[PDB]
Amino acid sequence: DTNIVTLTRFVMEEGRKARGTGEMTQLLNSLCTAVKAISTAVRKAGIAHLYGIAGSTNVTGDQVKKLDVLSNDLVINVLKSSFATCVLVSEEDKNAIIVEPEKRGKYVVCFDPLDGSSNIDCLVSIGTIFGIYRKNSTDEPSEKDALQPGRNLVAAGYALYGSATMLVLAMVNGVNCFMLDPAIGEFILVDRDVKIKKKGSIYSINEGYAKEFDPAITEYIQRKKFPPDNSAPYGARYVGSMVADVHRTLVYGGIFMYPANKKSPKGKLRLLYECNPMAYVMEKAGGLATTGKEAVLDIVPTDIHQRAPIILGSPEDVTELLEIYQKHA
Ligand SMILES: O=P(O)(O)OC[C@H]1O[C@](O)(CO)[C@@H](O)[C@@H]1O
Ligand SMILES: [Mg+2]
Ligand SMILES: [Mg+2]
Ligand SMILES: [Mg+2]
């Protein structure tokens, strides 16, 4: 056990020939602290009475749970104290948060402090999603610094509070998985340079919305169930937590879908702190992420709480669905 490859060491070793201020390492070390604190609260949530609602509604009009508030506070406090950030965007705050000059650093951070809130009370996998941008402009920090295309990401990933706690981190040359050792409260490198399979055998979507689906989604699903070449039909999985469904897509292959539909032109999931981070992870693992008509990472945001359709996973799977949308174009 005497040589520990922790997230910190990883993020220091690589960025050492890249030089840098090392505030990315500060950022991520800080974030890891909040994630550990969220994991331990989650693992004991019913005894600590942390289930239930906060008694509020957010800008996307979700019903705010207790762990939403707790996790939001932890992420914000640790990011500010990191001295690595200047602008913060959270699912739980109407406006971007501008860091006090005294603790400012050069990064902009967009995050979902707790993802999968419908699955909180039934003990299903939940998580934390983040994307990291460098502030470009020279003028005073503002919400506008968060309105960057996802292709501008310097780092992104998620924490998954599942059967084990995992930190999935994507940076410019690739994706790496770090598992939480609860005995020493360190994230340890467990999966190096993760690449997604070119094609999977699992499709993931809420078919409860079948009546609202566009003809292309409708066709694709039918094809997964009734393949034209007599291949085996695809298996279906939908946990209901974006972080768990995307994580399985990453390690098992296949496709994850939250499409636009007749009642939601822009889908449900949020571009800044849900769709862009996962699209980035997917592209760095060699997969794709599309709205059905354009790459998510290429969208230029105008609203920090903007929604986008997302279709992601194995390149050959996502490409088959894109061909169907094309065909229907
Ligand atoms: O109940 P639905 O509409 O399938 O929504 C599930 C999606 O909503 C979210 O909870 C939004 O956070 C995602 O984590 C999840 O993928
Ligand atoms: Mg929510
Ligand atoms: Mg979410
Ligand atoms: Mg959330």
Active-site pick, 27, 31, 74, 91: 91
Token readout for 268 is: 């449900």
> Which residues pair with residue 6 across a beta bridge?
188
| Ligand nearest to the backbone CA of 60 | 2
Ligand 1 cavity residues, CB under 6 Å: 115-118, 206, 240-242, 268-269
In the annotated binding site for Mg(2+), the residues are 62, 91, 112, 114-115, 274
Helix axes 315-328, 215-225, angle to 10 degrees: 130
Which amino acid belongs to residue 73? D
Q: How far apart are CA 249 and CA 253, in angstroms?
A: 5
Task: Tell me which residue has its CA closest to atom 10 in ligand 1.
Answer: 116
| Ligand nearest to the backbone CA of 64 | 2
Location of each CATH 3.40.190.80 domain in the chain: 194-328
Active site residue 298: no
Task: Tell me which residue has its CA closest to atom 16 in ligand 1.
Answer: 242
Q: What is the DSSP letter of 271?
A: I
Q: How far apart are CA 81 and CA 266, in angstroms?
A: 35
Active site residue 186: no
Active site residue 143: no
C-alpha of residue 126 to centroid of ligand 2, in Å: 11
Structure solved via: X-ray
Q: How far apart are CA 202 and CA 204, in angstroms?
A: 7
Resolution reached, in Å?
Answer: 1.9
Location of each CATH 3.30.540.10 domain in the chain: 3-193
Which amino acid belongs to residue 217? I
Atom of ligand 1 minimally distant from the CA of 238:
4
Are the CB atoms for 281 and 156 separated by under 8 Å? yes
Topology (CATH level 3) of domain 3-193: Fructose-1,6-Bisphosphatase; Chain A, domain 1 (3.30.540)
Q: What is the DSSP letter of 275?
A: I
Are the CB atoms for 75 and 111 separated by under 8 Å? yes
CA-based nearest residue to 125, from 202, 249, 39: 39
Cα 70–59–128 angle (5° rounding)? 40
Are the CB atoms for 291 and 260 separated by under 8 Å? yes
Task: Show Cβ contacts of residue 7 under 8 Å, excluding neighbours closer than 6 positions.
Answer: 28, 29, 32, 167, 169, 178, 186, 187, 188, 189
Alpha helix ranges (H) inside the chain: 7-13, 23-43, 66-81, 215-225, 242-252, 276-284, 315-328
Are the CB atoms for 134 and 107 separated by under 8 Å? yes
C-alpha of residue 70 to centroid of ligand 2, in Å: 13
Q: What is the DSSP letter of 46?
A: T
User: Which architecture, in CATH terms, is 194-328?
Assistant: 3-Layer(aba) Sandwich (3.40)
Active-site pick, 28, 31, 67, 115: 115
H-helix or E-strand containing 168?
A: strand 165-171
